[PDB]
Structures are given as structure tokens and as C-alpha cells.
């Protein structure tokens, strides 16, 4: 991949392993990352319920307008915690892990009835452990919005 990959339209690039694809995606994500101005700047805590509700509320408030205004990319994502000053990608990793653990628990979701303007867990394990698919019930718009938020 050092030399033969450099040739235009090489077949080894077409039939390359994971390395080539991940390297190309990392190059293009570096390209699209460093051309964004605005950020997320959401405020959450380390709990299970308030973390989820604050994440959902902040994400809904940020992207609130008449329909989606094209795909939007952000240079950085910063998160703020109560009684805990700190910013940087470390807060991004912490928020990702915490929110994933909160949404991966096999317990009733926090009652977010204020998302406007039933409560079964969103993701379950129909197959082997650690793999999930959405659980839809009565087809209410609140869960559709929450699925948009997780997406």
C-alpha cells in the first residue's frame, strides 16, 4: 500500500482490507472536521435519568427550526457538568460513555413527557448480548424524536 496504492485507480485500493477504508475515512473526516465553526455545547450530569433528559432537551433546543437545514457538521462537541468545571474531548468521551450506558440499560426510560412543543426501553436484545435494535410500541412522535436524537 506504500507504492502500488498511489497509482491512479489501483485495484489493490478497490480490494483493500479495513486499513485502506479506515485511513480514507479518517482523512476525509479530518477534512470535514476542520471546516466547521459552531459546536454543540450541551449541559448534562452523571446520573441516569437527568443525564438523558438534559441530553434530549439540549439537542432538541439546538436543532429547532422549520425542517432540517441541510447536514450540519461540527468541529468540536463540548459538554458541561454541574459542580464540575471542565472542557475538551475528555468530556466528549465521558458524555458518550455515560449516555450509551444510560440508553443501554434494560430499565424503563426516564419519563420525558415535556419533549413536545409509552415508556418501554428503546433498545433491547432480540439476539446475542450487547447488540440492540429499536423497540417500537404505539408509534408516538416522542419516541420518533428520541430516535432522531440518538441517531
Amino acid at each position: 500500500m506504500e507504492d502500488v496504492g498511489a497509482e491512479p485507480g489501483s485495484i489493490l485500493t478497490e480490494l483493500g482490507g479495513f486499513e485502506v477504508k479506515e485511513s480514507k475515512f479518517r482523512r476525509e473526516m479530518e477534512k470535514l472536521r476542520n471546516q466547521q465553526s459552531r459546536d454543540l455545547s450541551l449541559e448534562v450530569d452523571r446520573d441516569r435519568d437527568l443525564l438523558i433528559q438534559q441530553t434530549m432537551r439540549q439537542l432538541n433546543n439546538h436543532f429547532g427550526r422549520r425542517c432540517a437545514t441541510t447536514p450540519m457538521a461540527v468541529h468540536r462537541v463540548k459538554v458541561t457538568f454541574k459542580d464540575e468545571p471542565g472542557e475538551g474531548s475528555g468530556v466528549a468521551r465521558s458524555f458518550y460513555t455515560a449516555i450509551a450506558q444510560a440508553f443501554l440499560s434494560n430499565e424503563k426510560l426516564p419519563n420525558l413527557e415535556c419533549i413536545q412543543n409509552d415508556n418501554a426501553p428503546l433498545f433491547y436484545q432480540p439476539g446475542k448480548r450487547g447488540f440492540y435494535t429499536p423497540r417500537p410500541g404505539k408509534n408516538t412522535e416522542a419516541r420518533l424524536n428520541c430516535f432522531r436524537n440518538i441517531g
Partner: protein, 31 residues
């Protein structure tokens, strides 16, 4: 004990271009 130890670190990759190949066929690659 063991007089000769082994090094398990990073870097020190001087002109490496053939160690990335999948394990099952490394019998057919030298250096």
C-alpha cells in the same frame, strides 16, 4: 531467571513495509 529480556514498546519502525499483511499468510513474507 532470564538473562536476555524482550522489548515490547512502540516506534523504532525504520523502513517497514511488509509486516501489515494478515497473519495466516505471513509464512510467505520475509521482512
Amino acid at each position: 531467571m532470564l538473562d536476555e529480556p524482550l522489548e515490547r514498546t512502540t516506534n523504532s519502525s525504520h523502513a517497514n513495509g511488509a509486516a501489515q499483511a494478515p497473519r495466516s499468510m505471513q509464512w510467505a513474507v520475509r521482512n
